[PDB]
Amino acid sequence: QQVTLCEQYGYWSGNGYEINNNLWGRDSATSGWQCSYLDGSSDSGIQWHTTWEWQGGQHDVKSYVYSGKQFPRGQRITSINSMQTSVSWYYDTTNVRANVAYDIFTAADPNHVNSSGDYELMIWLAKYGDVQPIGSPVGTVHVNGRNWELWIGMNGNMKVFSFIAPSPLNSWSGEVKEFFNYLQYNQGYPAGDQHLIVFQMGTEAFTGGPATMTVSHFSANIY
């Protein structure tokens, strides 16, 4: 398809969802391109896909195109009752260096710019090739009925918690409050002083292609 977004930061919004052709790191590449496509949307979720090829800058993310759930600013993490989400996705080739991940920012200032936060929570449903999260792994943790390798890193002032699935999860239904709750009581995360800034699902593309990630369904319910 209904909408095609090939420009850097090309953007679509509808039904409480959005897509951003978020090619933030494209200058790191020696060549390449990427488009994002809206296949359909309703109040209950969005269907979209992205196709890309990127070369050069081996360890650099070229893009994190995403579908975001829209929500009002000002929701304190401990006051949020549910951050339920469901996704089904597939890559047309595994011969890429890329991941599939949720990206979530929180900040003490509820009006923080949406490109960062005081804290970042990532949930990596798949990783292809030798790509690795920021920081270092601290062990396996059991969260929301599944096991994850937890990585902790620092990007400027922002502390980053990345939960990595042990094998690709092409379909996942989760309660993201369980991840914040785990962090609150095991990693010193000050959830009572933090507010939700973004809630996104997408793919970080490093190198390879042409490759397509198709998202058959993405939805979230935040209240």
Q: In degrees to the nearest 10, what's the CA dihedral of 79, 182, 216, 71?
A: 20
65 backbone φψ class: left, alpha, beta (φ>0; ψ -120 to 50): beta
Give CA separation, 70 vs 125, 154, 165, in Å: 21, 26, 25
Catalytic status, residue 53: no
Question: Residue 30 gets which letter from DSSP?
Answer: S
DSSP letters, 49-70, are: EEEEEEES-TTS--EEEEEEE-
Kindly name the residue from 7, 18, 53, 120 that is annotated as catalytic: 120
| Residues 12 and 70: beta-carbon distance below 8 Å | no
Q: Which helix (H) or strand (E) holds 129?
A: none
Burial (CB < 10 A; 0-12, 13-18, 19+), residue 48, is buried
At 163, list the tokens. 């939960």
Catalytic status, residue 204: yes
Kindly name the residue from 7, 18, 175, 204 that is annotated as catalytic: 204
Experimentally, how was this structure solved? X-ray
On the CB side of 109, CA atoms within 13 Å amount to 7
Sequence-distant (≥ 6) Cβ neighbours of residue 90 within 8 angstroms: 170, 213, 214, 216
